Structure 1
């Protein structure tokens, strides 16, 4: 569904229900504005096959390749785990600096696009959620120190949704790795992190 005023054709998603605010005399009510929210409308440069720099992540400055635009309007990304160590991670649009280079214009890679697409199509936003019970399970450890950190990591790994994601991460990496690895300069470019210290005028989309 959409509203099409002035040719703009917005594209609408049903939004979740509102929090309630006091009425002038009796009780409280929901506000009625935008029960259909316009879609995310991401940067027009962005595409699935393109490799991008992770801006705020733990492994920030890594060059990681886009996977699925999720139904949350966030995106999934992987900087191939088996070679570069970067997981199949959820990330948001402004926190990822997309480069001009595209993976599926390399000759080997382009024949495995459908397999990548089917693995990608299966994943969604709900797979990545923290979950109150698991969140509590880590928290209840507070009441030596290194051991508890190890236990929390063990608990996250155990989770079936996390395990299912790691399976897909492994399968995508297994699918792409040999063909990427033979292309040594590209493999090195993937392994290599971002360059800028003082080298040139910052943040060009010539990159």
Structure 2
């Protein structure tokens, strides 16, 4: 579904309408009058097999591999946990700087790109979302610090939705482990962290 006024093809995506406002004279009504919204659209330099730099989380400066565009704007990323310690994380594009090197441009990685995709087509935003009952259970124990931290870690572990993400993380990491590792300098590149030395200039250097 789309519209291409002036030759554009903006692509429409269904959107719910939940904001409610009291109407002028008698009742109330849903404020939004629309059923579709044009979809996110991403930068030209966002491909699946590309390596980006996490920029804002607790993994700032870490390098990661794009995994999937989640049809909600946000994209899934894996700085393969087995080499980098960066889990399957759903991050948005504008908090990422994507480099110019594809992980699948290496001749020994390019072979397993199909299996990469066939492992990645099954992640979705609902899996990344945090479910209400485990959120409630985590907030319950808030009413000595190491104990509650460990409890939070273990309940996150036993979340059923986290388990499938961990399984995908594990299998994709095992798939990408040896082939990445046998390229020593690239493996160190991924394992390293991106800093901003005072010798380099942001508006001069390229991503």
TM > 0.5 fold call: yes
Measured after TM superposition, the shift of residue 44 of structure 1 is 1.2
Higher mean Cα deviation, 125-134 or 18-27? 18-27
Measured after TM superposition, the shift of residue 195 of structure 1 is 3.0
Question: Do the aligned residues in 2 keep the contact of 1:52 with 1:96 (CA within 8 Å)?
Answer: yes
Question: Do the aligned residues in 1 keep the contact of 2:17 with 2:31 (CA within 8 Å)?
Answer: no
Secondary structure in structure 2 of the residue aligned to 1:21:
strand
TM-score (norm 1): 0.96
Measured after TM superposition, the shift of residue 197 of structure 1 is 2.4
The 4+ residue runs of structure 1 with deviation greater than 2 A are 31-34, 203-207
Residue by residue, what CA displacement relative to the aligned partner does 1:17-68 show, whole Å, maximum 9, x if unpaired? 2311111111111134432010101111111111000000101101100000
Question: Do the aligned residues in 2 keep the contact of 1:100 with 1:205 (CA within 8 Å)?
Answer: no
Secondary structure in structure 2 of the residue aligned to 1:6:
coil
Measured after TM superposition, the shift of residue 150 of structure 1 is 0.5
Question: How many residues get paired?
Answer: 207
**1: CA distance between counterparts of 2:80 and 2:194?**
16
Please give the residue correspondences for 1:26-37 in structure 2 after superposition, counting only pairs within 5 Å. Answer: 26-37=26-37
Q: Which runs of 5+ in 1 are unaligned?
A: none
| TM-aligned CA distance change 1:144 to 1:87, over 3 Å | same
Question: Do the aligned residues in 2 keep the contact of 1:99 with 1:205 (CA within 8 Å)?
Answer: no
| TM-aligned CA distance change 1:169 to 1:203, over 3 Å | farther
